[PDB]
Amino acid sequence: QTVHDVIIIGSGPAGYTAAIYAARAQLKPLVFEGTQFGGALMTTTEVENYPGFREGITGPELMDQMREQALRFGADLRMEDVDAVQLEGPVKTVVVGDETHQARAVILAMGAAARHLGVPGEEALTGMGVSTCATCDGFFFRDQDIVVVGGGDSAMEEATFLTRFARSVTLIHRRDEFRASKIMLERARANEKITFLTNTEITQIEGDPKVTGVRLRDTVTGEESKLDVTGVFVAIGHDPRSELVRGQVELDDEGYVKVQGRTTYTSLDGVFAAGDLVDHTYRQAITAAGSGCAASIDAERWLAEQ
Amino acid sequence: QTVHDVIIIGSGPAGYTAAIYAARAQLKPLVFEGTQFGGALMTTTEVENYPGFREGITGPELMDQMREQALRFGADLRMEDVDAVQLEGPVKTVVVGDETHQARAVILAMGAAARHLGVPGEEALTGMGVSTCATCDGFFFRDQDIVVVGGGDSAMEEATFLTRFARSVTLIHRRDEFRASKIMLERARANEKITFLTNTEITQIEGDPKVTGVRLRDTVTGEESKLDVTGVFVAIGHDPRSELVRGQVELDDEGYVKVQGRTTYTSLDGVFAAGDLVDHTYRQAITAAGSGCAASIDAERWLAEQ
Ligand SMILES: Cc1cc2nc3c(=O)[nH]c(=O)nc-3n(C[C@H](O)[C@H](O)[C@H](O)COP(=O)(O)OP(=O)(O)OC[C@H]3O[C@@H](n4cnc5c(N)ncnc54)[C@H](O)[C@@H]3O)c2cc1C
Ligand SMILES: Cc1cc2nc3c(=O)[nH]c(=O)nc-3n(C[C@H](O)[C@H](O)[C@H](O)COP(=O)(O)OP(=O)(O)OC[C@H]3O[C@@H](n4cnc5c(N)ncnc54)[C@H](O)[C@@H]3O)c2cc1C
Numbered sequence: 001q002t003v004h005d006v007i008i009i010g011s012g013p014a015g016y017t018a019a020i021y022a023a024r025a026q027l028k029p030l031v032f033e034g035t036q037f038g039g040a041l042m043t044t045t046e047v048e049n050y051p052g053f054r055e056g057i058t059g060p061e062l063m064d065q066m067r068e069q070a071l072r073f074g075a076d077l078r079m080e081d082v083d084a085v086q087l088e089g090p091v092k093t094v095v096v097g098d099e100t101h102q103a104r105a106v107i108l109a110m111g112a113a114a115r116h117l118g119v120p121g122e123e124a125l126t127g128m129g130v131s132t133c134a135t136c137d138g139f140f141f142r143d144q145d146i147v148v149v150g151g152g153d154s155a156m157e158e159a160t161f162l163t164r165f166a167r168s169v170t171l172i173h174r175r176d177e178f179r180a181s182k183i184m185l186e187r188a189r190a191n192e193k194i195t196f197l198t199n200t201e202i203t204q205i206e207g208d209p210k211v212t213g214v215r216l217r218d219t220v221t222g223e224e225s226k227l228d229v230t231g232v233f234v235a236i237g238h239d240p241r242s243e244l245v246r247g248q249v250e251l252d253d254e255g256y257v258k259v260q261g262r263t264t265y266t267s268l269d270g271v272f273a274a275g276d277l278v279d280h281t282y283r284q285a286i287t288a289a290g291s292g293c294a295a296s297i298d299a300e301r302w303l304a305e306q
Numbered sequence: 307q308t309v310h311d312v313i314i315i316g317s318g319p320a321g322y323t324a325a326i327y328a329a330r331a332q333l334k335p336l337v338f339e340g341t342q343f344g345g346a347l348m349t350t351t352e353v354e355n356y357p358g359f360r361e362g363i364t365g366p367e368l369m370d371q372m373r374e375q376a377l378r379f380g381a382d383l384r385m386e387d388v389d390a391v392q393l394e395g396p397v398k399t400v401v402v403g404d405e406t407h408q409a410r411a412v413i414l415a416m417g418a419a420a421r422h423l424g425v426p427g428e429e430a431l432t433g434m435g436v437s438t439c440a441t442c443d444g445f446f447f448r449d450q451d452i453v454v455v456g457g458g459d460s461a462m463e464e465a466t467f468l469t470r471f472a473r474s475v476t477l478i479h480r481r482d483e484f485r486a487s488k489i490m491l492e493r494a495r496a497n498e499k500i501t502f503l504t505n506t507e508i509t510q511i512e513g514d515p516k517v518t519g520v521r522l523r524d525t526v527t528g529e530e531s532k533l534d535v536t537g538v539f540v541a542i543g544h545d546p547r548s549e550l551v552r553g554q555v556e557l558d559d560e561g562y563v564k565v566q567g568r569t570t571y572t573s574l575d576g577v578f579a580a581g582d583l584v585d586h587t588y589r590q591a592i593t594a595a596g597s598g599c600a601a602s603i604d605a606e607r608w609l610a611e612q
Contacts, residue, residue: 017357017592024355024445026470049330051323051595052358054374068360135603139330160610164332187611262568262587281568282600286323289357290596294588297441304466305493 010109012039014275121205129211316415318345320581320598427511435517
């Protein structure tokens with residue numbers, strides 16, 4: 001029966017920053033963090049490019065600060081997943097298991113999942129040699145031999161950036177055709193630090209504390225080999241977590257939530273969106289934090305208009 | 307004779323975050339911080355809504371972290387103002403006194419100045435009762451009697467937000483006409499917590515450690531009075547620091563630098579813009595930091611295309 005001012009869905013930097021602003025604005029935000037709360041930084045180690053930390057901070061340490069900061073101003077945080085939403089109209093409903101909650105405004109901050117290879121070693125060595133983010137982690141592989149997996153613009157983009165650091169980048173793709181644009185594909189072939197390895201997949205990532213090599217398989221002949229490398233960058237795409245809102249909020253062709261102009265307004269009145277659910281360009285904690293603030297200010301001012 | 311990869315102009319959150327990203331990307335950024343370096347947070351006390359600090363941090367402490375973080379990754383920081391720029395073409399030039407520096411890309415991060423009343427007490431009590439940012443500081447005035455100065459949408463917006471906290475908001479304006487939109491003006495007159503005081507100006511802000519009152523003058527009759535209040539919010543407009551780039555980069559009618567779509571690209575190739583020089587909506591440190599990251603990623607990827 002209680003209709004809250006605002007419900008926030010998600011607990012990465014965008015969700016917590018939206019919650020900090022909404023709570024400090026006395027909106028008493030109700031935040032569904034998920035059971036895998038804390039966003040993508042919970043799965044990494046050192047975060048060095050989030051401004052405000054001259055010697056860096058671990059991913060979980062930073063997310064713990066954000067969560068405690070949200071609590072300090074009165075956010076109501078629940079470590080539960082939203083299973084369904086009704087976002088159309090003056091009163092929006094979220095369903096969590098068999099419980100329901102309602103609000104005048106909803107901030108969507110569910111993020112985007114990086115796709116994974118699904119091979120042994122990939123998850124255990126994430127943050128210790130395996131990464132999905134060259135902007136985040138490429139700096140840690142100066143003068144090392146690394147691999148990049150994928151066939152699209154993402155892989156070309158990641159592989160290009162990594163050559164700023166690595167001694168060599170071996171770009172592996174499971175076919176001999178590339179989904180990447182002609183411009184992106186042509187540039188990497190010109191980059192002398194990049195070696196292409198087509199018709200190839202990783203079957204296992206080796207290493208007892210850190211990545212020491214990968215096991216390879218030829219997707220056509222089945223020939224197997226080993227490659228000594230100390231880094232693996234997985235760039236086979238992203239899946240924005242928009243499944244909840246498909247059919248109610250306009251998405252682009254790749255599933256990202258569309259927003260109006262430079263604002264966080266979605267196609268639905270009273271519904272705002274932030275973070276990597278929206279941004280398919282930068283995908284950083286600081287940009288997600290910024291947009292979560294913007295969504296909270298948009299929502300507060302929209303609520304004051306009602 | 308040396309042409310740098312990138313020059314950054316400004317040292318608020320946008321500039322330092324751009325410098326952190328560019329330095330960590332091995333672009334060896336050259337940053338002109340200004341003689342009044344560190345941006346708007348140098349002039350405030352406690353910053354509580356920048357995510358990552360569960361008990362807050364002072365403005366200067368936070369900016370010191372950002373500056374040291376930029377240095378850690380190799381940024382070249384100079385506490386000097388850029389006096390003129392030549393931004394058109396493949397090689398851009400900045401002039402600093404009688405010295406010149408050149409770069410393939412330029413990130414503009416000069417911020418926006420809040421306009422001040424220019425009366426005794428205003429600067430000394432900034433951060434101790436005087437503020438230009440309701441989103442930043444309104445939380446500190448719960449159940450207090452405060453004033454807001456100004457006649458436009460900014461003053462209506464600030465005064466509206468402040469009623470979430472204050473016991474009373476007295477909106478003071480030097481005329482009996484208002485430059486604010488009919489909708490904004492009509493809503494505040496409906497807000498029972500707002501009292502309008504037209505044809506009135508502040509001549510002095512009183513208080514030996516914190517704001518304790520203001521001296522008033524009637525702009526028509528000259529009648530003077532005293533008003534006991536513990537907060538003064540100045541909302542008489544902003545001046546984006548775009549003077550350097552007027553005539554080379556497209557600006558909107560209020561002087562903000564225009565950017566393309568959701569990117570940081572300006573109207574000039576190789577020139578990107580971040581922070582409150584661009585954003586005339588949110589004006590927070592976290593949003594400025596986010597856009598400074600975005601400008602640095604845009605610039606890095608644009609540089610790789612050349
Ligand atoms: C391994 C790794 C390392 C990284 N390192 C860095 C780095 O060093 N620097 C940097 O700036 N960036 C880094 N990033 C990127 C950064 O973490 C992300 O860009 C950022 O966290 C995006 O924030 P977000 O809030 O939009 O989404 P997310 O971080 O993805 O958080 C969304 C959260 O909401 C939850 N959620 C989703 N759906 C629901 C639902 N239905 N109900 C409830 N909760 C839900 C999710 O479980 C998740 O906890 C890294 C990413 C990865 C994967
Ligand atoms: C009193 C006050 C309190 C605030 N409190 C908060 C708060 O609690 N939380 C929050 O999130 N936000 C707060 N803000 C707002 C926040 O500080 C700004 O939104 C943010 O700093 C904008 O960052 P920026 O990089 O775009 O620009 P700025 O902060 O304005 O920094 C620009 C810098 O570049 C320099 N520069 C300009 N032109 C040149 C040039 N030609 N050459 C060289 N250098 C140049 C300037 O001198 C300045 O140092 C506050 C603002 C004020 C004024």
